[PDB]
Design a protein around this ligand. Structure first.
Ligand SMILES: *[C@@H]1O[C@H](CO)[C@@H](O[C@@H]2O[C@H](CO)[C@@H](O)[C@H](O)[C@H]2NC(C)=O)[C@H](O)[C@H]1NC(C)=O
Ligand SMILES: *[C@@H]1O[C@H](CO)[C@@H](O[C@@H]2O[C@H](CO)[C@@H](O)[C@H](O)[C@H]2NC(C)=O)[C@H](O)[C@H]1NC(C)=O
Ligand SMILES: [Ca+2]
Ligand SMILES: [Cl-]
Length: 475
């Protein structure tokens, strides 16, 4: 046999209750089918934000190793994933694969060296920043030092400015590109396609026809969001259909995953899980994910083994019969036997994150419990500091309340949950199991001892895109 084609489709801001297979009122026919015929990842985790998840996805290493613990990489920040990190596509490339990427990058772009084309991907088409207009592909940000809001194009074909795509919805553009890559792929060479869609991140834009099926949803945001998810579902359908028509499917491993929990402020939903995007509650880190592939030993099963987004690197590299030589110490594991055969996971522990300067920007013992952090070990999860907005946000069309609060007093800074038996984080057990709290605090301090300093530089006004009307490198 030849190494399988590895296709990774990463959705943006897809919430736990935003797929039909989780009881969502949003219709996701294709995702449901693909999940039903494959392996549903029920104990799978990502990070609570964009840059965090994507950096861990491509480096297979925690943010405490890369200095990306705090928030994300904003447009004018002179920062990227450290240049000494070896990315997944580089390793797959050395395994004899043809690497392609389509979509959102968000891993740095202030220097040419930070670009996907200079980090492992043979070809690239998409946008560099974290968000933009679906149709114009433009992004506006406030350049502090100048006190002006600059709007500029952020679209690329290779390293060139991708002009002439105005008034064209990004998902259709990206799907068409991916399908062209699938159709025109020269057989005998393994394919690696990383499809990082804009869907379903805000702005809440969708072609008007996807709105009618959801007239029952009164909430404006969820109404528009539902249509966005449905369109994305259709796009996912086209991609898989193409892998089949092209005859690549029989030796393809298709992985679908969200990059973080839904943002209720932007129509997303995580019910019945607690929290949302930006927080370390389950609603922000436990994500929608599944593997669809004829290579799976067991199909049509819900896998409850502990997996994290950082596990994909060593997993795809092994599937690619390659080697992880060249990378710095990895924080993930090869979980293919776990996903395919359902065997005990190699991972029993997961550090969610440690951020000393965490702030909830969105509208809502050896270890210092005032520091925002969370760790999962076995069935237990410990959260310290301010985890983020801790309300449960029920689905709008089913509940006449926007949020449900907990009984936590304002001064609370420690939580212990048995996630296995209490996935909705309803009952704190910290006082009931003091020794487990102590154990996890020691682990938190262990990780803290092996962390690099947080690198969150101030804006560099020289990011100003006015001269060329396009966001891009400046250093
Ligand atoms: C998914 O594939 C469908 C079918 O190929 C795409 O819809 C077609 O788009 C063309 C281009 O304007 C139209 O002329 C056809 O009438 C449409 N075909 C069908 C069968 O409806 C769709 O755009 C693809 N992409 C996404 C993101 O859904
Ligand atoms: C425990 O953690 C908190 C928050 O991480 C620390 O308090 C902050 O310390 C920084 C460090 O220079 C200040 O700039 C912040 O303004 C402080 N407050 C907050 C809310 O972040 C605290 O000092 C840590 N150490 C101890 C010994 O408690
Ligand atoms: Ca995101
Ligand atoms: Cl975090």
């Amino acid at each position: 046999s030849r190494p399988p084609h590895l296709v990774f489709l990463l959705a943006d801001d897809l919430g736990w209750n935003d797929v039909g297979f989780h009881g969502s009122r949003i219709r996701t026919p294709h995702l449901d089918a693909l999940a039903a015929g494959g392996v549903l990842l029920d104990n799978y985790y990502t990070q609570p934000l964009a840059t965090p998840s994507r950096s861990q996805l491509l480096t297979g290493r925690y943010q405490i190793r890369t200095g990306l613990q705090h928030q994300i990489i904003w447009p004018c920040q002179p920062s990227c994933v450290p240049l000494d990190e070896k990315l997944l596509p580089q390793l797959l490339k050395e395994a004899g694969y043809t690497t392609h990427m389509v979509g959102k990058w968000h891993l740095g772009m202030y220097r040419k060296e930070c670009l996907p084309t200079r980090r492992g991907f043979d070809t690239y088409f998409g946008y560099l920043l974290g968000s933009e207009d679906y149709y114009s592909h433009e992004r506006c940000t406030l350049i502090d030092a100048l006190n002006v809001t600059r709007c500029a194009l952020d679209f690329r074909d290779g390293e060139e400015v991708a002009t002439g795509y105005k008034n064209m919805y990004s998902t259709n553009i990206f799907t068409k590109r991916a399908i062209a890559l699938i159709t025109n792929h020269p057989p005998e060479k393994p394919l690696f396609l990383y499809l990082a869609l804009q869907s379903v991140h805000e702005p809440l834009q969708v072609p008007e026809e996807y709105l009618k099926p959801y007239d029952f949803i009164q909430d404006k945001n969820r109404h528009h969001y539902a249509g966005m998810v449905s369109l994305m579902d259709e796009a996912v359908g086209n991609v898989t259909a193409a892998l089949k028509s092209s005859g690549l499917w029989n030796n393809t491993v298709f992985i679908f995953s969200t990059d973080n929990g839904g943002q209720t402020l932007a129509g997303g939903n995580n019910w019945p899980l607690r929290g949302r995007k930006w927080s370390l509650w389950e609603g922000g880190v436990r994500g929608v994910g599944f593997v669809a592939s004829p290579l799976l030993k067991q199909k049509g099963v819900k896998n409850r083994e502990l997996i994290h987004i950082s596990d994909w690197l060593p997993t795809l590299v092994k599937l690619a019969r390659g080697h992880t030589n060249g990378t710095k110490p990895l924080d993930g594991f090869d979980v293919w036997k776990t996903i395919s055969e359902g065997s005990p996971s190699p991972r029993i522990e997961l550090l969610h994150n440690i951020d000393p300067n965490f702030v909830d920007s969105s509208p809502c013992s050896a270890f210092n419990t005032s520091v925002h952090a969370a760790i999962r070990h076995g069935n237990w999860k410990l959260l310290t500091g301010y985890p983020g907005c801790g309300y449960w946000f029920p689905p709008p069309s089913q509940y006449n309340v926007s949020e449900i609060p907990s009984s936590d007093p304002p001064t609370k800074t420690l939580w212990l949950f048995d996630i296995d038996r209490d996935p909705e984080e309803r009952h704190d057990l910290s006082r009931e199991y003091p020794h487990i709290v102590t154990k996890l605090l020691s682990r938190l301090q262990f990780y803290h001892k092996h962390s690099v300093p947080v690198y969150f530089p101030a804006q560099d006004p020289r990011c100003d895109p006015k001269a060329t009307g396009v966001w891009g490198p400046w250093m």
